[model samples]
Target: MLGNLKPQAPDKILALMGEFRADPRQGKIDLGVGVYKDATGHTPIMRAVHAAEQRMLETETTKTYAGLSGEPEFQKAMGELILGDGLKSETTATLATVGGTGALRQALELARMANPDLRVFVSDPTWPNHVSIMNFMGLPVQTYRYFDAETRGVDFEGMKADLAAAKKGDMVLLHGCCHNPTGANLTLDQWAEIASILEKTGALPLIDLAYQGFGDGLEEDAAGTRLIASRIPEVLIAASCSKNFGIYRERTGCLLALCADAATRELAQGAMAFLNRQTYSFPPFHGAKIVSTVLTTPELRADWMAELEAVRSGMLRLREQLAGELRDLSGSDRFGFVAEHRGMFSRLGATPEQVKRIKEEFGIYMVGDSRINIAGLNDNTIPILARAIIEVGV
Candidate 1:
């Protein structure tokens, strides 16, 4: 049976990381991985997280398991963080998961349990894992036009048209904010339009919010999710602490299932908890504890927000600098969309050949699809990348 298992391809991003490590070229730039890096090219632990860990070290009493669905404090804090007043305790069921990816898997499982024939409509250039997982699960997946390669922005009209085809009970996967690969997002008004479309089509929304603080401010980033929660009868939110809280290794994340009523909420909660039992048994508690501790304590919460704001602003500044450099080098504003795209990534719209040339000639490693991690760059490499893009005629 084991020998009959088919071969699997290595993940593209992880494979690129390996290639980058192997290259002996000095000063090789890595813009492939998704993790956030600071000016020094290190993914630092947030001050609040560090403080929380210290406090936990001194005070934590047990290594025992949390409840099957994890602690209510974590769920409540995360639910509120992602939904604000949008999350009603009576109507929302929450579950702690290994990470954002875990939450997504559980959400899809729950959806399957509820509707086995459900089809998932995803953005064409979404995070590769989204499609990969859906395919492995044998879920029927449809691509909805999202990225506009020519403009390097969202093709809203095309997206809406594609989404309009969704039937009742189908899952429409949306990037809550800071859209993963492309970084192009829908406006609040456009979100309203999407809400109306969902209402009309009777489709369900599964929002993947992996980069909340990585885009706009935390609250501002949640605005669209909150709006959808307010209008939709049911909404599924998969949020991650890996990015915003800088607790990647801890694998902290949660899934919020909003239902139409308390009765449905109870059912949803039981199903989610059951899914956890069937999968990982119990979610890891350390990361959730750190998140809850940081959130509930006023001083820590304020400090965390401040640090998060700095990180967000820093990435925005990098976007501006990169875009400016491209404009100066290319003698056109075509690359201005680099600044307009919010989040840690922006798909550069370069052909695969150009991407290969960039790696071979400039020692700069970006995904073959030309998606570059903005946080992977700093002032020094911004000029290098811009010049490389120009020289490659991208």
Candidate 2:
């Protein structure tokens, strides 16, 4: 049976990481993976996370399993973190998952349960895993124009036009903030327009809020999703704690199903719990506990917020530095989009050949689409990357 299984294509990003690793060159920079790294190229645990673990060590006595829906404290904490003033406790169902990926998968499964013939409408250049996973699940999927390669920004009109074709009950996937692969994002006005159109078309929106604090700020990032949720009758949200909390390996994330009202919430909650049981009997507990403890404890929460702000500001600083260097070298503000883009990534709009040339000639490894992790650069390497970009005529 194992031998009879068909071959699967290697994931491009993972393959790129392999190639990056095998290279023995000094000063090689890796910007392929989505994980965040500090200036020193280390993915360090948040100070708050370490403290929380120590607290748990002293307080936690149970080695027992959490429930199918995971810990209530975690769910509540994450919900509050994502929705803020707009969180509807009585009308939403929240479930802890292994990670952001798990949340996405579970949300897709739940969406299918509601509309078996549901077709997923995704961004044209969405996270590659979105397309790959949908294909693996045998779900019909379509694309709505999103990123504008020319401007390195959102193609709002094109996106709206494409999404207009979606029929009622179809799933419309949205990047809550800090769009993956391409850092382009929709404006608040655009989000409002989207809400109107999605309601008009009766298409259910599925929001993936993976990089919450990585964008403008925690509250600002959640603004779009909250607006849509308030306007729409129902919505799906998947949030990750890995980026903001520095708990990547802990596999902490949450999936939320927002129902029309309290009337349908219990049903939604039941379905979500059932899905959890069918997949993993229980989600990972340690990371969720840490997140809950940090958020619930005033001091820990304050510390985490400060550290998160520093991380956000650090990436923003790197963006400005890189953009400034590019402007100085190329003598053009064309690369100004880098500073404008939020999150850990920015697509330089370089072609495949340019990307390859950059890798070979400069030892800088970015994704094939020229998506570089802003967190990968620092005070020292900004000039180096900028020169390479102009040399390649990108």
Candidate 3:
């Protein structure tokens, strides 16, 4: 049985990481992984997170378990953070997950358990992990048009047409904000339209909100999820603390399933608890405790907010600077969509050969699909990338 196992394909992002590490060029740049980084190219621990850990170290008494679902306080804090106020807690059932990816896996598990013959609709160029997990679970996966290469923005018409094919009870996965791979996001108006479609089609919405605060700010990023939750009878939310809280290694995340009524909500909650037991037995506690402490303590929460705003501002400025430089260099507004996109990523829509040439010629590295991590660039390197893009005629 052990010999019967087939070798699996390595992850592209992880492979890219390997390539970047092996390259000895002094000016080499890595825009591969989804992790957040500062100007100094380091993923720094947030001040609030550091303080929370220190406080926990001094205050935490026991190394006891948090049960199958995790600590109630952790769930509450994460629920509030992800859903914002007026979250309809009466119908929402939440469980702590190992990380955002864990939440997504459990969400897919819950969905598969509920409807084994369901077709899950995903965006065309969604996060690769989404497809991988779905396929691994043997869940039927379908694609819905999302990104428009021509405009480098959301293809709303194509999306509307594609999602209309999904039948009632089918799961429709949505990026809450700051769409991965391509930073292009749907406007609130577009979100309202999507909600209308979901209601009309009677499809369920599963939101993956990994980069909430990294996008339009904490509340702003959550607005779309809130709006959909208010309108829909049910919604599934998978939220992550990795990006916003700067706790990637802590492996923190949560999964919330909303139902139509208290009875169904309780059912989902029970099912989630069972699922947790079947999976990891219990979620990790250190990250969740750190998050709970930061959220509950006003001082820590304030500092976290201030730092997050700075990160958001810095990324926005980089986007504008890149867009401006491209505008000046290309003598066209074709690259203007770079500024229009939000989040830590943006797809340049370059050809595979162009992507290869950039890496080979300029010592620059980005994903094969031309997606660049906006946080991977700095003031000095922004111009370097712009010049490279001009040289490549992207």
Candidate 4:
């Protein structure tokens, strides 16, 4: 069996991180990983998270096993954070998972259980892991046109056309906000249009919402998901606390399934719990506890919100500075999408060769798809990156 196994392909982002570390360039800039970094090039733990950890340390007693679905408080907090105060107890059910990745996996499992021949429709240039995981699970996957390469923005018309063709039971995966790899997003009006299509076609919507507070404000970022949930009879949401809470390693995430009514909600919740039992028995408790502590307590929640706002504003500032620098350097506004893009990343639309060239020639590290993490740059490195993009003819 060991001999029969083939070597796994390398993950491009992690591979780039290793190459960057080995590069001896003094000012080498890394825009590879999705983790948030402050202006001084540090991914600092948030104040609320620190306080929550201290509180948990003082209060937690036995390390008794949480249920297969994990703690109920974790689920309640996540549901409230993502769904706001409009969550219908009769319609929604949530399960704690290892991370955003785990939530995605469990969501897929739920889809497979619902329809054995189900196919997942993903955006053409979505987060790489979405397609990779589908392939790994032997699930048939199809691509819908999403990004407009030339403009570096969403191709809304093309996406609508593709989504219109989806069958009733098929699952259409959507980035809830701040689309990864390509930082372009759909407007609220666009989301309404999408919800109409999904409702009309009867396709199940599966949303991956990893960067809620990282994009627009938390409320604004969840607007699309809220619209879809309110309209659709069934939906799946994978929400992550890693980026916003600065708890990447803690692996805190929730998989939520929304159904038509209370009985269906119970069935969906049972399915989610079954999936959890089949995979990892119980999700990690520390991160979930920390999240619950922050959200439930007034002071902790306020501090967390403040820090998250600062981080969001910081990324926006970098976007403006980078776009401004590029405008000055290139003598044109063609690269203005840098400022228009939200969240921590922007797809530069550079070919693999150009991406490699920037790394080799300028010591500026970005993913092979030219996805640059805006949080990776500091005040001084912004101009360096801007110059590299212009010089490389991106």
Among all candidates shown, the one with the greatest lDDT: 1
lDDT for model 3, please: 0.90
Question: Per-residue CA lDDT of candidate 1, range 1-394, in tens?
Answer: 7999899887665677778999999989989877888888789999999999999999988898778998988999998898887668999999999999999999999999999999999998888889989998999999999999999888999999999999999999999999888889889999999999999999999999988887889988988998899999999999899999999999999999999999999999999999999887989999999999999999999999999999999999999999888888888998999989999998999999999999999999988889899988887899999999999999
Identify the runs in model 4 with alpha carbons over 4 angstroms from their true place.
Answer: none
Q: Show the colliding residue pairs in model 1.
A: none
Give the alpha carbon lDDT tens digit for every residue of 1-394 in model 2.
6999888877666677789899999998887768888867788999999999999999988888767898889998899898887788999999899899999999999999988999999997988889888998999999999989999988999998999999999999999999998999888999999999999999999999999988899899999999998899899998888888999999999999999879689998999999988887888898999999999999999999999999999889989999899989988899999999988988999999999999999999988888898888887788889989999988
Give candidate 3 misplaced runs (Cα > 4 Å): none
Indicate whether candidate 1 or candidate 2 has the larger lDDT: 1
List residue ranges in candidate 1 displaced over 4 A.
none
- Which scores better on lDDT, 1 or 3? 1
| Candidate numbers sorted by lDDT from highest down | 1, 2, 3, 4
Q: How many clashing residue pairs are found in candidate 4?
A: 0
CA RMSD per model (angstroms): 1.1, 1.2, 1.1, 1.2
CA lDDT scores, all candidates in order: 0.92, 0.91, 0.90, 0.90
Question: What digit string (tens of lDDT, one per residue) describes model 4 on residues 220-322?
Answer: 9999999998888998999898898999999989999999889989999999888888776788999999999999999999999999998899889889999
Better of 1 and 4 by lDDT: 1
The sequence of per-residue lDDT tens digits that candidate 3 reaches over residues 26-109 is 989888767888988889999999999999989989997756887878888888887777767788899899899999999988
Error of 4 at 204 (Å): 0.2
